[PDB]
Amino acid sequence: GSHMVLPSEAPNAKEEILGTVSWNLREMLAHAEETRKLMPICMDVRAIMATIQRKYKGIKIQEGIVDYGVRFFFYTSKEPVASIITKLNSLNEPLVTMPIGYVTHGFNLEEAARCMRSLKAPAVVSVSSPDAVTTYNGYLTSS
C-alpha cells in the first residue's frame, strides 16, 4: 500500500554558514536542504544512509551526484580522500559535511582536517562534539 503527502515547505534563507560547527546529521540535512548546498556522503556509512533514505523515501542508493531532496555526492569506500577532493574541485559548490576522511576511511581528526584544506571548495564541517570544533579549527589554522 502507498500514500505520500507531507508538509512540503519553502526555505528562503539568503544567508549561509561557514567554518566548522557542532551540528550532527539532522541539523545538516536542514541547512543542506534550505540552501540547496551540496553534501558529500559515503554509502559505506549505512547509519547515515538509514536516516537519509528514510527522510527522502523511495531512494535505493546510487552513486555519483545524487539529486535526491538534498543535493548529495555519493563517493565509494574505495575512493581516497584526496581523489574525492580532486573530484569535488570540478563541482566547486558550497558544501556542508562532516570531516569526510575522518572515520569511514580510517583517519584521525588531524589527518582529516589537513586533507580537507586540500579541498578547493567551501565546506562547513560538523564534528559530533563541540570541544572538537576547537581542535579541528586548530588544525585548519596550524597546517
Swiss-Prot record:
Macro domain: which residues? 17-143
Q: Where does the UniProt annotation place the signal sequence?
A: none
List each coiled-coil range.
none
Q: What is the effect of changing residue 35 to A?
A: In strain: Isolate Shanghai QXC1
What reaction gets catalysed by this protein? Thiol-dependent hydrolysis of ester, thioester, amide, peptide and isopeptide bonds formed by the C-terminal Gly of ubiquitin (a 76-residue protein attached to proteins as an intracellular targeting signal)
Q: How is it placed in the membrane, per its record?
A: Multi-pass membrane protein
- Domain of life of the native organism: Viruses
Q: Domain comment?
A: The hydrophobic region HD1 probably mediates the membrane association of the replication complex.
What's the stated role of this polypeptide? Responsible for the cleavages located at the N-terminus of the replicase polyprotein. In addition, PL-PRO possesses a deubiquitinating/deISGylating activity and processes both 'Lys-48'- and 'Lys-63'-linked polyubiquitin chains from cellular substrates. Plays a role in host membrane rearrangement that leads to creation of cytoplasmic double-membrane vesicles (DMV) necessary for viral replication. Nsp3, nsp4 and nsp6 together are sufficient to form DMV.
Q: What is this protein called?
A: Papain-like protease nsp3
Q: Which organism is it from?
A: Severe acute respiratory syndrome coronavirus (SARS-CoV)
The gene name reads rep
Q: Please specify the portion of the entire protein covered by the chain, as first and last position out of its full length.
A: 1331 to 1469 of 7073
